[PDB]
Amino acid sequence: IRASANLAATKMSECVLGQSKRVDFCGKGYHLMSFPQSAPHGVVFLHVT
Amino acid sequence: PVSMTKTSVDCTMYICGDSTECSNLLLQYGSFCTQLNRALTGIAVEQDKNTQEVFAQVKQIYKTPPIKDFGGFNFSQILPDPSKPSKRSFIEDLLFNKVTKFNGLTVLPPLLTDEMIAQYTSALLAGTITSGWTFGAGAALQIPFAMQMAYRFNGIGVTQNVLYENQKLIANQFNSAIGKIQDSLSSTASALGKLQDVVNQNAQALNTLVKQLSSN
Amino acid sequence: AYTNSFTRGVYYPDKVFRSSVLHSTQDLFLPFFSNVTWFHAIHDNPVLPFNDGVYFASTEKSNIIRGWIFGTTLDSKTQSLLIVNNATNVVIKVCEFQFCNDPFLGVNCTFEYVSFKNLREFVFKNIDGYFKIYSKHTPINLVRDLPQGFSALEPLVDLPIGINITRFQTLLALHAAYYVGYLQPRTFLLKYNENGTITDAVDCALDPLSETKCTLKSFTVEKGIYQTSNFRVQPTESIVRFPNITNLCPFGEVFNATRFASVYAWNRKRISNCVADYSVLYNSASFSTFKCYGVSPTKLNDLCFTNVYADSFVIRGDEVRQIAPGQTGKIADYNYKLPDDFTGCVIAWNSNNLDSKVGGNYNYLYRLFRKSNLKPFERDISTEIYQAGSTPCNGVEGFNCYFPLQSYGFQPTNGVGYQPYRVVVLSFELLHAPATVCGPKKSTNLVKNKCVNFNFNGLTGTGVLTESNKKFLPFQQFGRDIADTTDAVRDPQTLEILDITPCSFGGVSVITPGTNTSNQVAVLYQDVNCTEVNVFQTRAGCLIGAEHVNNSYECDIPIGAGICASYQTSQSIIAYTMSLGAENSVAYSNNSIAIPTNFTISVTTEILPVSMTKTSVDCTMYICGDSTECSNLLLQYGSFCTQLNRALTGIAVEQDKNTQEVFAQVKQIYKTPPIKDFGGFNFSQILPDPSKPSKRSFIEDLLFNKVTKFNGLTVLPPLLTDEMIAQYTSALLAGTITSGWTFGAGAALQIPFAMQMAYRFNGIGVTQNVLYENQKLIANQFNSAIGKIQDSLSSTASALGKLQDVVNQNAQALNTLVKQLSSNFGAISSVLNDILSRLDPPEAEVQIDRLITGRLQSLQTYVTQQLIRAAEIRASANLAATKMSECVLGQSKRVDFCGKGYHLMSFPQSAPHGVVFLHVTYVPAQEKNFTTAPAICHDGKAHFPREGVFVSNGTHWFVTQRNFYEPQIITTDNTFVSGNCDVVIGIVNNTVYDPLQPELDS
Ligand SMILES: *[C@@H]1O[C@H](CO)[C@@H](O)[C@H](O)[C@H]1NC(C)=O
Ligand SMILES: *[C@@H]1O[C@H](CO)[C@@H](O)[C@H](O)[C@H]1NC(C)=O
Ligand SMILES: *[C@@H]1O[C@H](CO)[C@@H](O)[C@H](O)[C@H]1NC(C)=O
Ligand SMILES: *[C@@H]1O[C@H](CO)[C@@H](O)[C@H](O)[C@H]1NC(C)=O
Ligand SMILES: *[C@@H]1O[C@H](CO)[C@@H](O)[C@H](O)[C@H]1NC(C)=O
Ligand SMILES: *[C@@H]1O[C@H](CO)[C@@H](O)[C@H](O)[C@H]1NC(C)=O
Ligand SMILES: *[C@@H]1O[C@H](CO)[C@@H](O)[C@H](O)[C@H]1NC(C)=O
Ligand SMILES: *[C@@H]1O[C@H](CO)[C@@H](O)[C@H](O)[C@H]1NC(C)=O
Ligand SMILES: *[C@@H]1O[C@H](CO)[C@@H](O)[C@H](O)[C@H]1NC(C)=O
Ligand SMILES: *[C@@H]1O[C@H](CO)[C@@H](O)[C@H](O)[C@H]1NC(C)=O
Ligand SMILES: *[C@@H]1O[C@H](CO)[C@@H](O)[C@H](O)[C@H]1NC(C)=O
Ligand SMILES: *[C@@H]1O[C@H](CO)[C@@H](O)[C@H](O)[C@H]1NC(C)=O
Secondary structure, eight states, rough: HHHHHHHHHHHHIIHHHHHHHOOOSSSSSSBBBOOOOEETEEEEEOOOO | OOOOOOEEEEEIIIHHHTTTHHHHHHHTTTTHHHHHHHHHHHHHHHHHHHHHTTTTOOOOEOOSSSOOSSOOOTTTSBBBBBSSSSSOOOHHHHHTTTTOSSEEEEEOSSSSSSHHHHHHHHHHHIIIOOOOOOOOHHOOOOOOOOHHHHHHHHHHHHHHHHHTTTHHHHHHHHHHHHHHHHHHHHOOOGGHHHHHHHHHHHHHHHHHHHHHTTTT | OOOEHHHHOBBOSSSSSOOOOOEEEEEEOOTTTTEEOOOOOOOOEEEOOSSSSSEEEESSSSSSOOOOOBBBSSSSOOOEEEOOOSSSOOOOEEEEOOOOOOOOOOOOOOOOOOOOOOOEEEEOOOOOOOOOOOOOOEEEOOOSSSOOOOOOOOOEEEOOOOOOOOOOEEEOOOOOOEEOOOOOOEEEEEEOOOSSSSSEETTTTTTHHHHHHHHSSSSSSSSSSEEEEEEEOHHHHHHHHSSOOOBBOOOOOTTSSSSSOOOSOOOEEOOOSSSSOOOOHHHHHOOEEEEEESSSSSTTTTBSOEEEEEEEEEGGGGGGTTTTTTTTOOOHTOOOOOTTOOEEEEEEESSSSSSSSSOOOOOEEOOOOOOOOBBBTTOOOOOEEEEEESSSOOOBBTEEOSSEEEEOOTTTTHHHTSSOOEEEEEOOOOOOOOBBOOOOOOOOOOSSSSOEEETTTTTEEEEEEEEOOOOOOOOOOOOOOOOOOEEEEOOOSHHHHHHEEEOEEEEEEEEEETTOOOOOEEEEEESOTTTTTOOOETTTTTESSSOOSSSSSOOEEEEEEEEEEEEOOEEEEEEEEOOOOEEEEOOOOOOOEEEEEOOOOOEEEEEEEOOOOEEOOHHHHHHHTTOOOHHHHHHGGEEEEEEHHHHHHHHHHHHHHHHHHOOOOOOOOOOOSSSSOOOOOOOOTTTBOOTTSSSOOOHHHHHHOOOOOOOOEEEEEEOOOOOHHHHHHHHHHHHHHHHHHHHHHOOOOOOHHHHHHHHHHHHHOOOTTTHHHHHHHHHHHHHHHHHHHHHHHOOOOOHHHHHHHHHHHHHHOOOOOOTTTSSTTTSSOOOOHHHHHHHHHHHHHHHHHHHHHHHHHHHHHHOOOOOOHHHHHHHHHHHHHHHHHIIIIIOOOOOTTSSSSSSEEEOOOEETTEEEEEEEEEEEEEEEEEEEEEEEESSEEEESOOOOEEOOOOOEEEEEEEOOOOOOOOOTTTTTEEETTTTSSSHHHHHOOSSSSSHHHH
């Protein structure tokens, strides 16, 4: 969970809080941004690609 | 899956619930259950730390403007609804609705309740709607959402000119795409797989602990 | 009267010296900060009890005491202990001498030994059969109250008494106040310096400030919450709801019976609708053997049973162990089988005089032949002739034809080994059937909404009892949850349904500021009403101690549900709903743009633990240190030792591997030039100083100065020593500051630091011209930031927070491993040589089984803590390897990963079992406030910036990058032509300067 959560923190940092040039890191396709959504003990990302 | 139910068992209550003899016989093992309690409280604190690192990277309170003149990109489904009694998104409401003890082991309440976890998410959404990448680094710089998509287009090496040339078209595609998210997220239970399975996994872990209270 | 006792009432526990360490002792002590009595000594020496001992304190000017007395009549008629010290002839005897009513000094025996302005303390304790004397004198200069300070009484003649004396008398000064207190088994935390004199002590169960000190084992506290204890409101009384039936049960039918069955046709009498007391069975001395592993004999009255069957039969006195789970025998296999999971209690009283007669009690019968084993509790009335041979047996006995049901002969003339013995299985099966035989206890009235000790039909516990609307069927008795714990019950007196929810409980957490700041406390009772408890009630529960405030501040010490405290205004701890920052509404619009005119190059210190102590705990010398038999028994487990030692050597070689992966990422070692001229950038803080004895930095010297056994466990030295990790850190730091990023990739390519910082600005999206205009200002900013982090790392303990804590979990990891040398794991003592020199080989093998299984429970979970904590170390170490790779060996274009803000570079400094980075970052400071448009139209064409953003002050249209206000006119070397302006929305009409246009026109 903490590996996926540091993944989520870098994901939010580089995909929400910025734009990631890492191809296929923010879902399939050329990553544009992501939208956080709270969920019961989790985060749902709306990765626009 | 970013976080977990902060389960915390007691050396007294879970292992030897309300028993002086059994608590003494567990302290017969010395500090052994004490580092277990330390480890579980550590899991609680690092779970709080995960939630803090994913959400409270933000240093301020960002709130959405009263007008959603977002350049054609209606977010009232992804942004908190003022008509809702709890200021959460509509897709978050279907994430709260379609997807959703006292016997020696407790659950600690989160440092961040559900409504203000939703408040941090609203803060992150607001920062990445009106401020984009700038509030992650330093001071909050107000930037339009059209600019964020146009500059984000540059990031992947496609030129931003196409975006303003087909702004209405991609507004239609992105709004209908979020609508397809709404439809799939409301129709298929498999769309919540990676959280349903992990919440269930914690549920079976706790449930096996519960089943050991039947085990001889 | 009462007066303040700050630190008095304390004595030394033993003769053992402890050095610079904090240890907790429990004994008969006097509580601190307690109001103790103050008496006067004019115109008063009463008798006080001595049941717990005394702490005596006297003020004297002529030492007016001539005897401590312990007896009954104290007038030479009986044994009474006497103490007289006439300066050469110290006497401690207990014979009969005649003393006065008040012994005083003006300036059958059992032992013999010869040894305001004044304060003298005396303490007497009674354990384990000798004669103690405590004595300590000290000069004071105070007359009003108790002086402040800690003096620890040391027994001079230390020989622990053990006499039971509950009465003593005081000897007051009459040529002066005295302190007397009652002693309790309370534990304190007593502080030893290096030197042997106790300087301070905390009754750690006094206030939440001290309750922090119980769990932290220190005198200074950090601002934070601490799990201290487990609050659970104690139930006030005891409740029992047994069924109404109260008739006397025919236990005479099964004990005082005239007729007993035999083992072939033993009576299986259901005993129900009666009251089973068992107390007359305890008071009866008639039973000889009362054997059962299922239930206990004596603590049975409080239990109410499902249904009890009395299996009445007769078998021999040697056959009494045959009625047991798993016993195999002739009668046990041919007449009466006991299951392995048999619950119930078999009783065998002596039948020397009951089941016998002169001619022979010939009515007791038993099977001796069967071709199959018996089922438990079966009823075999088979009357066929057993076939011994192969011949068919037509009811004709003789050869190969014998009948199985054999009889006994019981006569009083027979021997006591053949004399009839009575064994009866009162089979107490606790099964599903409704409880009907309860103890002879009186019932109590029912209570709701208040947790109470309940004992419903034998099931004990605590919980609240509310009415329930469920339709329990008749014969339906309990509701069990998933844990098969009783969730609901039907009251057997009144046909109503009662939920059992166990009583309110939770941990005790403490809100406190630092001991250098305040002593005002806050105790938490969490997730409850303030009913079983300036009180604040939230979703987290009741917060006792801090003031509720509607104003919200930054959250400092969280207690739960985002209610948290802070110490402000006089000042006090204030609890509030936490603010999620400063309330910063953003003036969003479709044309609102904010661009920083000014920045600051802040350096954020992210500290990553990258190595650890290379521990190698060999199993033989740890679990079986200095023992041959323990190692011989340990090798019986086969491969656990070789696999755990492989795991630990893998840990060591992988710590070397990742410290190589975080430091020796370069094939070539560089050294700094003798002239440290780096374009105004003061690197003398981070480069190694030749004036130091070790070739290490000044920042590293801070990292080493304030920023910092032999029981079979050792540390392996790292391959990369302290000086070697220092020389890698200097080598890669020199590689950075002299070569940029290329030394991690290939051949080292020389670049000056101004060029390097220019391209590292270029790497985040800020153009290097800002650096090359303000190189002096940024030299001042970076050097002052280096000085600021120098001050921070030299003045704040949290600068080593996330590394020192990792060093800690390593330290109490090894320390708890050492605690398993003191924790017992079910053995008689945890000391190995104490076991091997005392304890026999047979149970020594099973306690070495306990030590191997449990020492490797602690140890294999220490090693999986090494491997999960080293998944943390390895995740942070591959993280730090990539931080070296694209921060030291490179530049990170990926945002908010290599430091707060836009990362430029990072400085590796060596740290004890870790690495610290100075992530030099670009953070904007203030912005001016502008309007924008998505594109600009000049001649019908739409223009878009290739790099930067169209910005405007309202009068002139500029293009600047996203992260610095660099006002430049719009240029076709920064914009292009794409599409037309009628389709874009938000475009405004402007004019475009070209870098072609004045060159064409002029
Ligand atoms: C909000 O989104 C809905 C989609 O259901 C759309 O019909 C509506 O026009 C949008 N409103 C605005 C103001 O964009
Ligand atoms: C302090 O002394 C007063 C004197 O009467 C007494 O009433 C009170 O109980 C004392 N406090 C404690 C905590 O013993
Ligand atoms: C002083 O003490 C000794 C024994 O300690 C005793 O024999 C002697 O009588 C004492 N002297 C007086 C004056 O009581
Ligand atoms: C400790 O003992 C030393 C002698 O070893 C003495 O000089 C000193 O005064 C003692 N106290 C302290 C506080 O060092
Ligand atoms: C059974 O016999 C014993 C033997 O003295 C007697 O004490 C006891 O009261 C008897 N039980 C009855 C009469 O219920
Ligand atoms: C029950 O009956 C079967 C067949 O009639 C027989 O094999 C078995 O031994 C019987 N068991 C008992 C306890 O009578
Ligand atoms: C039996 O229990 C019920 C419970 O209310 C009560 O009415 C009745 O009095 C009880 N029987 C006796 C003999 O007390
Ligand atoms: C707290 O107590 C009030 C009244 O005593 C009650 O209405 C409420 O339900 C209780 N809540 C909890 C969580 O115990
Ligand atoms: C920016 O300019 C607008 C226009 O005058 C003004 O309303 C706003 O307060 C300014 N500042 C910020 C931070 O938006
Ligand atoms: C930019 O910021 C620095 C430090 O924040 C400050 O000293 C300086 O005056 C500011 N302005 C310019 C033009 O450098
Ligand atoms: C670097 O810092 C040191 C700090 O002691 C200072 O003395 C020195 O003047 C600074 N500059 C250079 C070029 O060494
Ligand atoms: C921006 O939105 C405001 C209302 O919020 C509107 O008056 C204005 O015309 C809009 N401008 C553009 C360029 O969309």
